[PDB]
From a paper:
To test whether agarose could be used to deliver crystals of large, multi-protein complexes, phycocyanin (PC) was chosen as a model system. PC is a cyanobacterial antennae protein, part of the light-harvesting complex, which channels excitation energy to PSII, subsequently driving charge separation across the thylakoid membrane, the membrane that contains PSI and PSII.
A slow-moving stream of agarose has been developed as a new crystal delivery medium for SFX. It has low background scattering, is compatible with both soluble and membrane proteins, and can deliver the protein crystals at a wide range of temperatures down to 4°C. Using this crystal-laden agarose stream, the structure of a multi-subunit complex, phycocyanin, was solved to 2.5 Å resolution using 300 µg of microcrystals embedded into the agarose medium post-crystallization. While the growth of crystals of PC in agarose was very difficult, we succeeded in embedding pre-grown crystals into the agarose medium, which allowed a full SFX data set to be collected from PC crystals delivered in agarose. A second syringe was filled with 5 µl of the highly concentrated PC crystal suspension (ideally 1011 crystals per millitre) in the crystallization mother liquor (the same mother liquor as used in the agarose preparation). The crystals were then embedded into the agarose by alternate movement of the two plungers, whereby the solutions moved back and forth between the two syringes at least 40 times, leading to the embedding of the crystals in the agarose medium at a crystal density of 2 × 1010 crystals per millitre. The time available for data collection was limited to 4 h of protein crystal screening beamtime at LCLS. A full data set for PC crystals was collected using the vacuum setup at CXI during this time as well as a brief test run on PSII crystals. In 72 min of data collection, we collected 41 100 crystal hits from PC, of which 14 143 could be indexed in a hexagonal lattice with unit-cell parameters a = b = 153.4, c = 39.6 Å. The PC data set showed a high overall multiplicity of 250.6 and a multiplicity of 12.5 in the highest resolution shell (2.63–2.5 Å).
Residue numbers in the entry:
A (entry chain A), D (entry chain A), F (entry chain A): 1 to 140, 143 to 150, 161 to 174
B (entry chain B), C (entry chain B), E (entry chain B): 1 to 72, 75 to 174
The structure:
């Protein structure tokens, strides 16, 4: 998995050398940043239930039909409303994972890879998920570098969906 | 591979769960303690040659049969390989220290090493000694009070010892 | 690989014998019946996406644990792989239909698939269900009376079912 | 083995795609041709014994010494007369196999591959076999597309021997 | 690989010892006897085609089932392969003669040959006959008194026979 | 291992052919040379103990400190004096091996490969060993082609050390 640290170790390793100073300097760099992105992560973790729920409704609002429409891909049914709640949950969880690791690695590996293919195969429109993301981006309730770090991982996600 | 952060994410992803407050605290302590970790890698790294040379002097002193003709370290090219192996293993250990996770070491170095040496007829037991000798050398160097700001690095040294011991086991 | 014709030639070559009148008749019936075979491949092919999507919807409906976190189809990249696997297997089946022989399927796809999934810890039983669901979908589509000239394709559908069942067995 | 059908499947497979329409069109093409080449094949199969015998003698004629000459490679001996009868049999059998498969595949695989090497190693002159082929080509007794298809596989063989 | 000289050096290096007077004498006799060795390689080499052809005629005469349809030497391409195999094995034997050591043969040819033929379902026993037939042919040709200066090459012929027998064993 | 003979067999083998005449001519060539280089080898073998001892002292002379100096790499200690005696022994033994094989093969494989790395790692200066070599080169007591062959393998060694 791709983090700042593994990226460094990877460079050294593919050149068969011990770690360089610049590599060490990079990890220090990462440690300096870890502070803020970690308090963002646990922030997001603590009022996630808020954020998820909030997010769903907000999508539902923006795209009314999802409440009503013949379709397993639609949150018309209550089964689907679950699925969607779950999907949103998954998205939030990932931005925290990114904050924790200090890069997109976990989202790249657990969500972005195969995202096209899955959205396509299952009639899941990206707009649904991009709205949910903008919503969370608004109300995470973060200020400071912590918000910077969070909104960064979010925008990354929004891109992938477009 | 994984670092201490990714490990926890990986353990979390698979239960499908967010990180518990415990977990956040753990990683923060790691981060807090990060200067020590960095010093340890820098120090062991900067003395890699020495660690290797002196552990090899030691091992061959204790196990002369390796350099008796026929011995698995007789001839200069086998000697070189041995030394190279020791530097390799030292190098993957630094990686693991820097990551706070044994996975790099494990995956890219320990995996199927026993079997390789067995094939070769390199005595795994002897490798594992060479490893142990470097450990003791590297701990000492890493944990040197001189030229560094005083503080307790003992937990870090135990971690470090862990990786070395782990490597020794993978081939004994 | 082999097609129905080459198979018979191969069976013949090895007894060192010419084809019996029976054999000639068999292949001629195949040829005669060839439009059906072509329709079947065209139809299953043209709906490949659908077959795959709907069998996957089905399987996961029946086997939710696959998409419970930790499940062998949790994460989008594993989901993609799964879907890809299903399309692969569907694709080699069309090949076998078109050839009238399972060899392409066998050789280039089923061979050592069980072992691969076992390695991966993909539940072979579950693959074999995904296969069965596609079979039923593909038979239905292939054997649709609409938009086609009426005639009996039942022998062809059994052949087709054969290949799907064969694939399901290779991994259960 | 190379037939029209396997050649198509091979194209799709090496490009990792489902079969194309042109590929389907090719197999249809093959099916249209199968009719004639199949009745040629069973024709040749039914008076092969005729044709083989006939063929041998015809070679013997053209190359008298083969009846008499110190040599295991020669049909002087009766052992060798067998071998030669057998060899001819093999050649005929293959053109039928080709007619059945709808290409040179079976002859390419069971006869042409290694033909040089074998003729060389065993002092088997190609002329012997090219005569036998011209003979069969004359008297297969085929007319129509059936003869076309047969003579095609035969000429292919004759080439290989030169 | 090794030649007779390198073999002795290798055996010596590993005891860490210089060569005994015995050893020096052995190699000198080899050198002394070198024209014979050279003639033997030249002769077997120059008739390689013949050796191969006639041993193959022989084997198939004794073992017709190999060329019965279905037989492991039926079809021209399998026949070619067989012949090729025989030339291969003959060729690595010449190498070993020229070196005075079986190692080239061993390492680059006999190693894991049994297993290959087994996989293929080539009857190893039959290969081993083909080998034996070439041996007898090649000995005869090598040891022909005509066109060569009279002297005793019998020790050389035994060596040669050795390599052939060694190859026959590696696949029976 | 690289000898004249294996080098030939290697050429043929990598081209998948039987040995050529030039290859045969090369081995003959080697056999012609074997005579002298073999009597050199057994010469060197017979008064090696002389030569080794002689060699050590001669190094000791040229580099006095090796007799006295805190260091496991130094023959100050008697342990080290052994090691050094042994090392010299190893060098002599190799030139004989070369004479026997008719090339540098054995020295390339048992000594030259890894020589840099080892000298470096163990604080073994090349000068020590180059002196020992010049000494042996002087007093092997060989004349004729035998000396030629010997001094050849020696100079080869001396190069490697510079
Ligand atoms: C156990 C390892 C020993 C110990 C370590 C220790 N270090 C500090 C402080 C620092 N270490 C560094 C080193 C780096 N920062 C980087 O970016 C890089 C990459 C080139 C390196 C190598 C720095 C800058 C500091 C702070 C400055 C300083 O020297 O004080 C401490 C203080 C506590 C802390 O975590 O900062 C300690 C305890 N100290 C010992 O006594 C052990 C033998
Ligand atoms: C079982 C599969 C169903 C069935 C099939 C069926 N088809 C025909 C006739 C035809 N099928 C084709 C299709 C093709 N010819 C080609 O070259 C290609 C490649 C692009 C294709 C796809 C054609 C041209 C015909 C003849 C024209 C026609 O539509 O009639 C029959 C008639 C019998 C026969 O073998 O020709 C049948 C029975 N029919 C069913 O009811 C099944 C659901
Ligand atoms: C057993 C093999 C038979 C035998 C051999 C034999 N040969 C000699 C002498 C010679 N052989 C050669 C051949 C070569 N020298 C080369 O450099 C090359 C590479 C092209 C070859 C092939 C030569 C030149 C000689 C010397 C000249 C000559 O022909 O006399 C002997 C004599 C003893 C010796 O070792 O020289 C013998 C016995 N002789 C037999 O009867 C065996 C059937
Ligand atoms: C003598 C001229 C000087 C001397 C020698 C010395 N060497 C060591 C250690 C080593 N010598 C070698 C050399 C080889 N080992 C091989 O297998 C081969 C090829 C066959 C060679 C050439 C090696 C590898 C070592 C290190 C391992 C070992 O001890 O065998 C020492 C002790 C080194 C130590 O640091 O403990 C000594 C004293 N040293 C001098 O000062 C002499 C001028
Ligand atoms: C040293 C204390 C002991 C010893 C070592 C020795 N090893 C070889 C050969 C090999 N060692 C390895 C190990 C690795 N290669 C890698 O890339 C990695 C990291 C993933 C490792 C850990 C391998 C693969 C080999 C075989 C390939 C090679 O030689 O490079 C030798 C030489 C074996 C030979 O005869 O060729 C030696 C001497 N030997 C001892 O006696 C010590 C106890
Ligand atoms: C909510 C915004 C909208 C909604 C959601 C919905 N999704 C499905 C099915 C799936 N959702 C995913 C997403 C993931 N699975 C993973 O493992 C990961 C990475 C951790 C992600 C992002 C997937 C793969 C599926 C298909 C398999 C599954 O069901 O889990 C449904 C049901 C789909 C069906 O066709 O049966 C629904 C309803 N749908 C809406 O309309 C909301 C606006
Ligand atoms: C789907 C219903 C089930 C499932 C599938 C799954 N597979 C993987 C990994 C692989 N699948 C294959 C299969 C093939 N590759 C080919 O080229 C061919 C044709 C010859 C086949 C049949 C292979 C080789 C792999 C490993 C390599 C790869 O991933 O591409 C995964 C991901 C495994 C992982 O964690 O990496 C999955 C998810 N999984 C389920 O849960 C279903 C029951
Ligand atoms: C008849 C026209 C002339 C004749 C024939 C002859 N052949 C042999 C030996 C062989 N014939 C073949 C041919 C094939 N074997 C296969 O498997 C295939 C493909 C299916 C073919 C085409 C081969 C390989 C041989 C050698 C092995 C064998 O005997 O089967 C002989 C005996 C050869 C000998 O030297 O002992 C003869 C007589 N020979 C003539 O003169 C006729 C004009
Ligand atoms: C001949 C008397 C018997 C026999 C031989 C036969 N072999 C094959 C296939 C192979 N033979 C080899 C052997 C080697 N390849 C090398 O490079 C070397 C030197 C290191 C050797 C010794 C191999 C590897 C194969 C498989 C690969 C290939 O075919 O080239 C065949 C054909 C097998 C097939 O059906 O493809 C045959 C016929 N067969 C007999 O019946 C004899 C008893």
């Amino acid at each position: 998995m791709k983090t700042p640290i593994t990226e460094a170790i990877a460079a050294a390793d593919t050149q068969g050398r011990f770690l360089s100073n610049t590599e060490l300097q990079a990890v220090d760099g990462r440690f300096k940043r870890a502070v803020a992105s970690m308090e963002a992560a646990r922030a997001l973790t603590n009022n996630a239930q808020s954020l998820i729920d909030g997010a769903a409704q907000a999508v539902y609002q923006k795209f009314p039909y999802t409440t009503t429409m013949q379709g397993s891909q639609y949150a018309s049914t209550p089964e689907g409303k679950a699925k969607c709640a779950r999907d949103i949950g998954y998205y939030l969880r990932m931005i925290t994972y990114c904050l924790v690791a200090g890069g997109t690695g976990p989202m790249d590996e657990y969500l972005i890879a195969g995202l096209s293919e899955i959205n396509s195969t299952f009639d899941l429109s990206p707009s649904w998920y991009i709205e949910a993301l903008k919503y969370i981006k608004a109300n995470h309730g973060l200020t400071g570098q912590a918000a910077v770090e969070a909104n960064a991982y979010i925008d990354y996600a929004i891109n992938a969906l477009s | 591979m994984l670092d201490a952060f990714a490990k926890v994410v990986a353990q979390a992803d698979a239960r499908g769960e967010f990180l518990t407050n415990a977990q956040f605290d753990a990683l923060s302590n790691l981060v807090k303690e990060g200067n020590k970790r960095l010093d340890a890698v820098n120090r062991i790294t900067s003395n890699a040659s020495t660690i290797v040379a002196n552990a090899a002097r030691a091992l061959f002193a204790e196990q002369p049969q390796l350099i008796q003709p026929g011995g698995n370290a007789y001839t200069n090219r086998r000697m070189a390989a041995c030394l190279r192996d020791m530097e390799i293993i030292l190098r993957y250990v630094t990686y693991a220290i820097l990551a706070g996770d044994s996975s790099v070491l494990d995956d890219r170095c320990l995996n199927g090493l026993r079997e390789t040496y067995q094939a070769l007829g390199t005595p795994g037991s002897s490798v594992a000694v060479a490893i142990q000798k470097m450990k003791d050398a590297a701990i000492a160097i890493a944990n040197d009070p001189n030229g560094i700001t005083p503080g307790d690095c003992s937990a870090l040294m135990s971690e470090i010892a862990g990786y070395f011991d782990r490597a020794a086991a993978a081939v004994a």
